[PDB]
Amino acid sequence: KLPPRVPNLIPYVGSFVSFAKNPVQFIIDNSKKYGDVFTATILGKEMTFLNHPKILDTFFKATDNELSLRDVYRFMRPVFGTGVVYDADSTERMMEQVKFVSSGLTTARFRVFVDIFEDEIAHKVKELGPEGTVDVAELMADLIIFTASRCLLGDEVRQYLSEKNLGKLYHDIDDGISPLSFFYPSLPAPKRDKARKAVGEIFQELLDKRREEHKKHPERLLDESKMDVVDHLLTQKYKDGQELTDVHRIGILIAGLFAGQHTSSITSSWTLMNVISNKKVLEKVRKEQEEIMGSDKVLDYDKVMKMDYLEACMKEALRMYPPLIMIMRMARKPRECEQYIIPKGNILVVSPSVAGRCTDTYTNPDVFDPERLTERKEHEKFKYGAVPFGAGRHKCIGENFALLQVKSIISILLRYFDMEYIGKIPDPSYTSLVVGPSPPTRMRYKLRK
Numbered sequence: 001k002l003p004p005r006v007p008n009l010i011p012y013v014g015s016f017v018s019f020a021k022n023p024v025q026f027i028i029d030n031s032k033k034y035g036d037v038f039t040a041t042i043l044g045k046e047m048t049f050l051n052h053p054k055i056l057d058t059f060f061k062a063t064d065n066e067l068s069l070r071d072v073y074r075f076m077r078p079v080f081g082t083g084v085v086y087d088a089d090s091t092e093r094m095m096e097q098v099k100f101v102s103s104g105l106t107t108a109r110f111r112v113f114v115d116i117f118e119d120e121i122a123h124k125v126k127e128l129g130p131e132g133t134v135d136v137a138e139l140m141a142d143l144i145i146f147t148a149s150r151c152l153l154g155d156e157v158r159q160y161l162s163e164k165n166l167g168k169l170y171h172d173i174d175d176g177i178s179p180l181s182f183f184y185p186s187l188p189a190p191k192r193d194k195a196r197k198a199v200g201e202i203f204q205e206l207l208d209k210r211r212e213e214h215k216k217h218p219e220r221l222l223d224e225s226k227m228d229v230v231d232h233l234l235t236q237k238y239k240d241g242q243e244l245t246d247v248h249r250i251g252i253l254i255a256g257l258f259a260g261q262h263t264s265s266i267t268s269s270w271t272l273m274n275v276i277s278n279k280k281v282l283e284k285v286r287k288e289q290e291e292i293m294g295s296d297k298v299l300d301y302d303k304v305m306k307m308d309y310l311e312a313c314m315k316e317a318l319r320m321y322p323p324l325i326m327i328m329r330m331a332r333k334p335r336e337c338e339q340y341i342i343p344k345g346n347i348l349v350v351s352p353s354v355a356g357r358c359t360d361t362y363t364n365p366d367v368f369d370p371e372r373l374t375e376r377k378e379h380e381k382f383k384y385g386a387v388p389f390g391a392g393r394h395k396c397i398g399e400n401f402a403l404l405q406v407k408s409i410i411s412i413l414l415r416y417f418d419m420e421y422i423g424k425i426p427d428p429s430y431t432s433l434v435v436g437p438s439p440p441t442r443m444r445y446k447l448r449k
């Protein structure tokens with residue numbers, strides 16, 4: 001029958017307070033006591049957590065009529081939009097919409113992205129000057145506002161960032177979503193809604209500016225290097241023949257940009273922080289960069305694809321500090337799990353944060369040691385030993401773009417700057433929807449040329 005239970009402190013609320021204090025420790029602490037599969041009530045919700053790589057297969061291999069994502073991620077509706085992604089009428093429709101994004105993430109676009117990255121950092125060093133100190137998380141966020149927007153939407157968006165305060169609107173949207181929004185989706189957030197409508201109107205004009213741009217220059221549609229997500233959204237249909245609405249298009253763009261930004265700036269912060277405050281790691285990374293760059297002065301894609309150790313550094317940081325700390329599904333029918341029979345209506349939960357520290361998989365898991373991956377292969381010990389991008393049917397489709405964005409920015413900054421971090425490396429703050437480092441995150445920098 002049912003699994004072991006974390007015991008209600010209180011009716012209805014259940015264990016929400018300890019869970020709230022630190023959701024990762026909550027799961028680890030209840031693991032050590034009640035075992036790899038336990039149910040805890042949290043603000044109304046029968047939440048059943050799966051805590052070991054070895055039980056995960058049925059979680060990742062199920063169908064969406066068995067384990068639903070849309071039942072648990074629909075709360076994102078007032079960020080994304082009605083009828084968009086996890087609010088689509090069907091999983092079939094969500095999947096098509098996820099593919100309109102993916103279709104701007106091609107090898108030919110990726111070559112152009114490295115250029116965009118070079119260009120936005122060029123502009124950013126003018127602000128930073130010959131030396132100074134800067135907040136790591138803020139810098140990465142601010143760069144990726146400009147780089148993600150141009151990569152997915154094309155160059156036209158930039159003037160909205162530069163002159164119509166678009167970056168401020170994103171923030172207003174971003175702040176209006178909360179871990180709590182999962183438990184209470186209908187919470188008022190009039191600031192968020194105002195901005196969401198603001199961005200809605202700006203992207204509608206962006207669609208409209210493009211639609212005549214297509215008429216004036218239809219060679220664009222033949223140029224694989226210039227085709228972005230906006231292009232694909234205007235020119236594709238659903239498979240069954242139906243037209244997209246401009247409402248759906250806007251929504252998909254916003255959702256895509258949200259995915260394009262937070263996970264990446266966070267991961268890029270934790271990666272860069274750990275790299276620059278470890279002499280050995282920094283040395284290996286600089287060495288690789290010297291080797292790949294040779295006598296060229298700027299990046300290209302092919303270079304980025306050779307940056308294997310820098311990629312292991314990033315992946316080490318995802319093990320330790322995964323930005324999505326919990327992956328979840330609603331059980332639309334009872335689900336069997338080992339001895340147990342997880343009941344209908346329960347929310348199955350899997351944590352990449354918890355996986356990253358599991359002593360079965362990783363020696364000395366509190367050390368940033370990328371050679372645990374490149375030499376010891378500790379991730380391979382299980383199929384789901386490492387799931388920072390998920391796995392199976394809904395595995396992240398941004399993975400390659402994220403690897404590209406974060407490797408490029410870091411390589412570029414390392415080209416420009418000597419950098420040192422100030423103080424000990426912080427803990428994750430479990431304040432936000434997407435978990436990043438407890439501020440502040442300061443470093444000094446000095447130009448090298």
Ligand code: HEM
Nearest residue numbers: 098259260263264267327388389390394395396397398402
């Ligand atoms: C370090 C960076 C990133 C991390 C850690 C990450 C993590 C994840 C994870 C864990 C999932 C699985 C969610 C689930 O199964 O419930 C996922 C799905 C997804 N990610 Fe990412 N992601 C990253 C970057 C991106 C980027 C850059 C994009 C798009 C530009 C993106 C788009 C998506 C999409 C569209 C899905 C949908 C998969 C589905 O529900 O079918 N992600 N991501």
Ligand SMILES: CC(=O)N1CCN(c2ccc(OC[C@H]3CO[C@](Cn4ccnc4)(c4ccc(Cl)cc4Cl)O3)cc2)CC1
Nearest residue numbers: 023073085179180182255256258259263324326327396433
């Ligand atoms: C209370 C608490 O402490 N809690 C921690 C945070 N808990 C949580 C909330 C949401 C969540 O959602 C992950 C799912 C849904 O959202 C994304 C996030 N995402 C970003 C990049 N890749 C995926 C996504 C996918 C595709 C697209 Cl188009 C856009 C996006 Cl935003 O995947 C995962 C976990 C809620 C509970």
Ligand SMILES: [Ca+2]
Nearest residue numbers: 050051350351
């Ligand atoms: Ca887990």
